[PDB]
Amino acid sequence: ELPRNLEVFNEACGHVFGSSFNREDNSVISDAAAFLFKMHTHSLDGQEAKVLRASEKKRERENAKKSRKAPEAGMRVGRSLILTSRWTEYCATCVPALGSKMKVIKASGDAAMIQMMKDHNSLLRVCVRIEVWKARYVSLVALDERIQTLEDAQWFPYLSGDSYRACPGLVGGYFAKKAAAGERGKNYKKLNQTAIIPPPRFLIIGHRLQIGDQVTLRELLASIAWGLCDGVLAECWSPSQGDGSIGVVVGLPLQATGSCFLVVASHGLSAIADSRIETNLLEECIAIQKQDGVIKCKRSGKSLYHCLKETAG
Amino acid sequence: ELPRNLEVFNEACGHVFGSSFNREDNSVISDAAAFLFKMHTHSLDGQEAKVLRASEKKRERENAKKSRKAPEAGMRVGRSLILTSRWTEYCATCVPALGSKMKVIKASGDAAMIQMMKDHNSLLRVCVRIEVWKARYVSLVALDERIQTLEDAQWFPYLSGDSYRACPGLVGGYFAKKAAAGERGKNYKKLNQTAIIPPPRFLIIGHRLQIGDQVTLRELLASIAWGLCDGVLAECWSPSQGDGSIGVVVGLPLQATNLLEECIAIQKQDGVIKCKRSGKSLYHCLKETAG
Amino acid sequence: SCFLVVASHGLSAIADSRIEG
DNA sequence: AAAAAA
DNA sequence: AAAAAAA
């Protein structure tokens, strides 16, 4: 019915949050995923201290975290998430010990522990994807003070190192910058800043985002883009009968990833750093694939965040 | 009556892959060449360990590779290649011992050992040529993650160090960059990203690419250029009656407001003609013309 | 506020949406 | 084409 | 828009 990843995430969130975990609210799913990501990265109080090569100023914080009491049952998480009495057992049983590595577990040969580590990795990936989607969603109506120029905006979203390790191709930030600057191996993955990520309520169900889905404008935009993307992407949405709140998806952008506009010099020709520039920018178009067929829509020339702000005024 | 260069490759492919080796498929030939190259570079499981100056992680990787079980007969390599029972004998008798240098082979004077080393080197060259052609073919529709600017694109294809050591004039990548960023001399070879490599199905039989031979658009484009080359090169191909994804070569480029008026020289059946550039890379043109 | 428009889906980046012209 | 040889 | 590595 469901792949291993989504089944693992559903089991984990159910075990940790009882009946309080709503399966149809994006905010609740994002909060649950954030808490689970903290639990599986040993970022909660009372978990192992990260000291392997930590600096003394970091060992101070790690020792403070270890000494601090672990979360108690019934604690309020986010807005409408409540920890069950059996969350400690789940944390002790389903979270690999700090520093666990797949090679060591495989050398052990225990099938149960191998499966546990596989579930841990899949859960980390799912939680990081939900985190990236929520970062886009927040950026749709809340500018990041850090992003002031195009160079800053190039490395969105600014998520932690664990996020980058889980999903290097979707997570930007300091570690994506470091990977790009440093040596690039065969495993190097570039930051796909506008990759399509289904809403959390769709991601945990396994339903791929497609034409016809009954989604809100903000969540669709968070799926296909983020705040500083061009406003023309709003053409991928259409309000339903009677307006209300939830509309429908009429199309999806093309070239969401893998856009290169280089032309190397060859056979006596001259190199081109950008085919597009080689010149009004506002005349550019995006190929939106609809059910009927692909249509080229003229760019708005304005940010998605500012379009949403203007339409909400 | 093929050259020894191609005869060695054909014999090795036969011995190692039985009847599963189809000589009319570019993908199958590329898979076979990759397997033979990793066999002759001591990169398969169960082969000697590259532990002359390996670092801790590299030492561990090489020791694990040696300890791991070697490939066995019937193994599936790619999509349509199956190893035969004779591949162990071929690896034992034709692949030189790890670290073997031609100096010592010549000093010994054994004619058979000299012939084996020469065949090994020729096979490495052929395999690397096929690897470069397949890299071009892949890049025609999917660009390497390392290529973001022209400086990065200047070093395509990004192949391994052994590949560069075998074909310095065709292979790019990290070792080509290092050679450029170091000393230069007579032995130094310049990377030619658009050197004409015939398709493997033609290369292994010695057939030189020429006007009028049936090919596919991607085949010709990979043979004479790669993805980020200008799209005007697509004019070197013309579809046949009904197309069917198979056409014919009509020309081969030479030299293998005004910026977009630059022209390339195409040698046609009549003579050299000047064709205006398109301005878009072959990758972008193929993406836009796919539908 | 910020008036940037990052490059996406084949569009070119804009350093300022207002200055465009 | 022969030689060299992270 | 699979899996194996892994401040």
In a domain, A197, yes or no: no
Taking CB atoms and an 8 Å cutoff, what residues of chain A touch B265? 267-268
Chain D positions within 7 A of any protein Cβ atom are 2-6
Least Cα distance to B140 among B237, B226, B245, B229 occurs for: B226
Domain boundary (A109, A139, A169) is at: A139
In a domain, B245, yes or no: yes
The resolution, in angstroms to one decimal, equals: 2.9
Chain A 112-141 residues in 7 Å CB range of strand E: 118, 121-122
Q: Answer yes or no: is A153 CB < 7 A from strand E.
A: no
As a rounded value in angstroms, the CA-to-C1' distance for B227 and D1 is: 30
In a domain, B282, yes or no: yes
Secondary structure of residue A70 in the 3-state scheme: coil
Residues B209 and B114 in one domain: no
CA distance A251 to A273: 31
The domain in which residue A282 lies consists of 213-311
As a rounded value in angstroms, the CA-to-C1' distance for B141 and D5 is: 35
Method by which the model was determined: cryo-EM
In a domain, A263, yes or no: yes
In a domain, B157, yes or no: no
* C19 CB within 8 Å of a chain A CB: no
C9–A233 CB contact, under 8 Å? yes
A259–C14 CB contact, under 8 Å? no
In a domain, A163, yes or no: no
- Any idea what the Cα angle at residue B138 is, between residues B143 and B130, rounded to 5°? 130
Residues B211 and B116 in one domain: no
In total, how many domains does chain A have? 2
CA distance A87 to A70: 11
Domain boundary (A139, A161, A195) is at: A139
What are the contacts of A119-123 at 24+ separation with CB within 8 A? A119/A4, A119/A8, A119/A94, A120/A40, A120/A94, A120/A95, A120/A96, A121/A166, A122/A4, A122/A5, A122/A8, A122/A9, A123/A5, A123/A8, A123/A9, A123/A12, A123/A36, A123/A40
In a domain, B180, yes or no: no
Residues B15 and B105 in one domain: yes
Least Cα distance to A31 among A134, A119, A132, A126 occurs for: A134
In a domain, A29, yes or no: yes
Q: Which are the contacts of A61, defined by CB distance < 8 A and separation ≥ 6?
A: none
* B279 CB within 8 Å of a chain A CB: yes
Length of chain C: 21
Secondary structure of residue B253 in the 3-state scheme: strand
- Position of tokens 């995006």? A286
Query: With contact defined as beta carbons under 8 Å apart, do B266 and B252 qualify?
Result: yes
Q: Answer yes or no: is A289 CB < 7 A from strand E.
A: no
C2–A301 CB contact, under 8 Å? no
* A307 CB within 8 Å of a chain C CB: no
Residues B8 and B136 in one domain: yes
